[PDB]
Design a protein around this ligand. Structure first.
Ligand SMILES: *[C@@H]1O[C@H](CO)[C@@H](O[C@@H]2O[C@H](CO)[C@@H](O)[C@H](O)[C@H]2NC(C)=O)[C@H](O)[C@H]1NC(C)=O
Ligand SMILES: *[C@@H]1O[C@H](CO)[C@@H](O[C@@H]2O[C@H](CO)[C@@H](O)[C@H](O)[C@H]2NC(C)=O)[C@H](O)[C@H]1NC(C)=O
Ligand SMILES: *[C@@H]1O[C@H](CO)[C@@H](O[C@@H]2O[C@H](CO)[C@@H](O)[C@H](O)[C@H]2NC(C)=O)[C@H](O)[C@H]1NC(C)=O
Ligand SMILES: *[C@@H]1O[C@H](CO)[C@@H](O[C@@H]2O[C@H](CO)[C@@H](O)[C@H](O)[C@H]2NC(C)=O)[C@H](O)[C@H]1NC(C)=O
Ligand SMILES: *[C@@H]1O[C@H](CO)[C@@H](O)[C@H](O)[C@H]1NC(C)=O
Ligand SMILES: *[C@@H]1O[C@H](CO)[C@@H](O)[C@H](O)[C@H]1NC(C)=O
Ligand SMILES: *[C@@H]1O[C@H](CO)[C@@H](O)[C@H](O)[C@H]1NC(C)=O
Ligand SMILES: *[C@@H]1O[C@H](CO)[C@@H](O)[C@H](O)[C@H]1NC(C)=O
Ligand SMILES: *[C@@H]1O[C@H](CO)[C@@H](O)[C@H](O)[C@H]1NC(C)=O
Ligand SMILES: *[C@@H]1O[C@H](CO)[C@@H](O)[C@H](O)[C@H]1NC(C)=O
Ligand SMILES: *[C@@H]1O[C@H](CO)[C@@H](O)[C@H](O)[C@H]1NC(C)=O
Lengths: 409, 185, 99, 99, 50
């Protein structure tokens, strides 16, 4: 309707989750061991193909380096390793489920323990090896704990220079001031809001381990890598048109001039298998790199500051975020703001007084049936109309829809 | 850091167990169990075989168990160690000494292969030096492990870096994430 | 020779319904239907808010409401021509069909 | 100059267009029909080439599955199917070309 | 067949990137008002329609 408006009278604090892959497995391949093994004739025959293997080695090495670069870019965002004070009081906000647990030797939060015990997994092949990552799990957990300690005791100040202290309720008031809600809303509802926050965090736990399909993105990478390695290993027992899949039988069952072709067929087949594996790995590496770039951007914007992009750091008006470490990935806990309990109202664009139009400064004119009030946009809080919160800037015979009333000076 | 070649541990002798020498355990040795060829390390297992079954089979296609033809014994089969070889070095404008990293092996096996048999590693004359430190990424030879913390210079493995100290030598340490700090909330 | 084409899960009518729902939501509510429950607001008022969002005071819209709307209408008409006259505008979608 | 400024005294409303591809065609391939056809000797010779075709089929199925997720992500932004009021008066604005 | 499959995979990756960009534009330019310069048109953004 064109004289009606709706304004919320209550709000809600909600916590969501988000999972993003970061890195994947690094592998290295030895051509002579895989294709030939311990046969001199096979090596001599393979030598006639030139340099089909330096390219494969270079590609695999590049993938391995990029895998470490991805994690270094995502997690190593700060240089100072901040620490949290021993006394954990923050005006009613309870961070136990995300702060590190001193009792456990792993030095991980309970949610990180849940993720690690939930993901699980899915050594020596014929010339195939797996290299360990540069950064261990403890170092990643230390980085995450440093980020959490920086974002709890400093706000966004530690992302643009030296870290500056501030009490937590004042930081929350600053963050409400960033979505169009005045400060006094928080200070008058400090006890309730915290409670809501706490409750949300609890539900997060029961929403992670109970549902088995939540952490599917991280399991897909491990499953695909294992499947590719198993397929490559199993391809070694194919004839490819020859008379046998074993070089020893071919050599000691026929004259060398005939055995040349039989060995050549196997060489061609195994080269084709290696090429297919390398190409698939390259494509998957590109996809993983794109995902890692997105994760790094989300870490920079949602965690180190307050975002104004819509639906970027969760559904609703963004407040803050917290990172948690996962195998081959990261998990974000977005905290948002949601209105509730709307109500019918009647509005006017301007108010006429002594032949002068009046417009609100920061608010909307609203009427409850008898009296007119000016209130802020995102929370119902009427005020008495006054020249303090209005500007005239016009006349009464231009605006379409003006309603004339009184404005006390 | 560069990767140059690969190393293999050569077999020592051959073993025949027709139900004809004795049997050797915990050694990279050739074997032939009634036509069952192949070489590797034979160690006792605990896989309760069926009374009429003697072969073993892994997930896909490789044997991993076998029964002794003479006496009823269950023992595993493991391929002899192999892996890549990496060389750690500063620029030639700085020094001429290097370090070697044997990827994915235990230091004791490499030491036994080098200084005891003197003929098992593939690159014998290539292999010189004696300064052994064991990491999760493999056996590192030629670097002295200090217990300080520095910014990473040459990545090696799981949180281990190397650098040209300063007399002048090559050290290995654990990388430092950053300076310690704590704002007084 | 064994080369088949599968149909998309969502038909064209469903996509049109989604687009119509989005258009109705952004016309009758503004940006309030993307962050929670949808709330009513007259169109000139949300246009005044959108002018206020780029550093222009409210009274500019309310004293030019008849003019601005006219301009808007005219612009829409030209959209019917530029796409229709020039045939190379939709070259991005043809290639996917071609390749 | 260091004491001269320029300030506009009037404005203009303009409308542009942007085109973006979203999805493409989903296909599936059968190896035995394409490579061999209906001859058993060719199939018996082909089954000695390992498991190339399982990989090909898996890749094609992955692409086909991703094609629907693209559209679902792009268009399914809302939960309610909002409806426009019967009377289309929005202060002089005309949406007849898009509704 | 292998060549066909590889080329299809590459084109699928490109189309996925385009679809992600389209989804971001739908989220930011339609459901709200953007302040990123030259992201939802040339000028000062007001609104968009799909
Ligand atoms: C806004 O919603 C909250 C959440 O329901 C309301 O808080 C509840 O108020 C009732 C009334 O006394 C209590 O019995 C509940 O225990 C409160 N909930 C919690 C979690 O403490 C709040 O009253 C609502 N605001 C208004 C103005 O009604
Ligand atoms: C903050 O939350 C923790 C839970 O993570 C509270 O610790 C207790 O934890 C045990 C088991 O983990 C529960 O059975 C108790 O109910 C929890 N206590 C309470 C009061 O709920 C911890 O007490 C909470 N508060 C503070 C200040 O740490
Ligand atoms: C701002 O620009 C608009 C658009 O040109 C002006 O409106 C036009 O004014 C001329 C001169 O009076 C008329 O002939 C046109 O018919 C008007 N266009 C429309 C769509 O009504 C407007 O006058 C300009 N503002 C000022 C203060 O000059
Ligand atoms: C909104 O714009 C449409 C399109 O111009 C208007 O429809 C036209 O109306 C005139 C007058 O009745 C007709 O001569 C045209 O043939 C119509 N065009 C079409 C394409 O049907 C419509 O009238 C406008 N809305 C209002 C309320 O004026
Ligand atoms: C909008 O205002 C006009 C005044 O010209 C009125 O005719 C119309 O009924 C109003 N809209 C609604 C939904 O009542
Ligand atoms: C606001 O007005 C509409 C119009 O009738 C009505 O359907 C809705 O229930 C009203 N909202 C409340 C909270 O009563
Ligand atoms: C409307 O607001 C006025 C403020 O003066 C108040 O006196 C009146 O009771 C309100 N009406 C209702 C129905 O609450
Ligand atoms: C005040 O508003 C009433 C109702 O719209 C109108 O009749 C009256 O003329 C207005 N006052 C003046 C001075 O125009
Ligand atoms: C190497 O072998 C020794 C032999 O007892 C063992 O104690 C040690 O744990 C092994 N090292 C690794 C890394 O497996
Ligand atoms: C290095 O770490 C501490 C330093 O005091 C010491 O206890 C440890 O024995 C040292 N290890 C060496 C020197 O190998
Ligand atoms: C800057 O101002 C001075 C005096 O105010 C004037 O002489 C000079 O020309 C100005 N600079 C330029 C580039 O015009």
């Amino acid at each position: 309707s064109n004289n009606s408006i709706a304004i919320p009278t209550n709000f809600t604090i909600s916590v969501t989750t988000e999972i993003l892959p970061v890195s994947m497995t690094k592998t290295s391949v030895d051509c002579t061991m895989y294709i030939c093994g311990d046969s001199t004739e096979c090596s001599n025959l393979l030598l006639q193909y030139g340099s089909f293997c330096t390219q494969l080695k270079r590609a695999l090495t590049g993938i391995a380096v990029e895998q470490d670069k991805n994690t270094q870019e995502v997690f190593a965002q700060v240089k100072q390793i901040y620490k949290t004070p021993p006394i954990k009081y923050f005006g009613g906000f309870n961070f136990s489920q995300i702060l590190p647990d001193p009792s456990k030797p792993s030095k991980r939060s309970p949610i990180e323990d849940l993720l690690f015990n939930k993901v699980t997994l899915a050594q020596k092949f014929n010339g195939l090896t797996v290299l360990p990552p540069l950064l261990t799990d403890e170092m990643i957990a230390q980085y995450t704990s440093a980020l959490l300690a920086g974002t709890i005791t400093s706000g966004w100040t530690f992302g643009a220079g030296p870290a500056l202290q501030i009490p937590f309720p004042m930081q929350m008031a600053y963050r409400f001031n960033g979505i169009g809600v005045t400060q006094n809303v928080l200070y008058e509802n400090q006890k309730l809001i915290a409670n809501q926050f706490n409750s949300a965090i609890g539900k997060i736990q029961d929403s992670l381990f109970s549902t088995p399909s939540a952490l599917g993105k991280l399991q897909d990478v491990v499953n695909h890598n294992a499947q590719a390695l198993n397929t490559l290993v199993k391809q070694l027992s194919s004839k490819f048109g020859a008379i046998s899949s074993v070089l020893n039988d071919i050599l000691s069952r026929l004259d060398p001039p005939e055995a040349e072709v039989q060995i050549d067929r196997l060489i061609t087949g195994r080269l084709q298998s290696l090429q297919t594996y390398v190409t698939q790995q390259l494509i998957r590496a590109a996809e993983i790199r794109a995902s890692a770039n997105l994760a790094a951007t989300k870490m920079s914007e949602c965690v180190l500051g307050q975002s104004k992009r819509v639906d970027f750091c969760g559904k609703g008006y963004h407040l803050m975020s917290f990172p948690q470490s996962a195998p081959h990935g990261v998990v974000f806990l977005h905290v948002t703001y949601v209105p509730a309990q709307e109500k019918n109202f009647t509005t006017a664009p301007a108010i006429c007084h002594d032949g002068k139009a009046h417009f609100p400064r920061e608010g909307v004119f609203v009427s409850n049936g008898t009296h007119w009030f000016v209130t802020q946009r995102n929370f119902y809080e009427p005020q008495i109309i006054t020249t303090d919160n209005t500007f005239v800037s016009g006349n009464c015979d231009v605006v379409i829809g003006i309603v004339n009333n009184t404005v006390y000076d | 850091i560069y990767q140059t070649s690969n190393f293999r541990v050569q077999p020592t002798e051959s073993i025949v167990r027709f139900p004809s020498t004795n049997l050797v355990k915990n050694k990279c040795v050739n074997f032939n169990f009634n036509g069952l060829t192949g070489t590797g390390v034979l160690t006792k297992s605990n896989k309760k075989f069926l009374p009429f079954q003697q072969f073993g089979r892994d997930i896909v296609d490789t044997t991993d168990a076998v029964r002794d033809p003479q006496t009823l014994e269950i023992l595993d089969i493991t391929p002899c160690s192999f892996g890549g070889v990496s060389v750690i070095t500063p620029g030639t404008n700085t020094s001429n000494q290097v370090a070697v990293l044997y990827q994915g092996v235990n230091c004791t096996e490499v030491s036994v292969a080098i200084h005891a048999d003197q003929l098992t590693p593939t690159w014998r004359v290539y292999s010189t030096g004696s300064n052994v430190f064991q990491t999760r990424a493999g056996c590192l030879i030629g670097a002295e492990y200090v217990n300080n913390s520095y910014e990473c210079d040459i990545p090696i493995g799981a949180g281990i870096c190397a650098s040209y100290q300063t007399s002048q030598s090559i050290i290995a340490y654990t990388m430092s994430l950053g300076a310690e700090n704590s704002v007084a909330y």
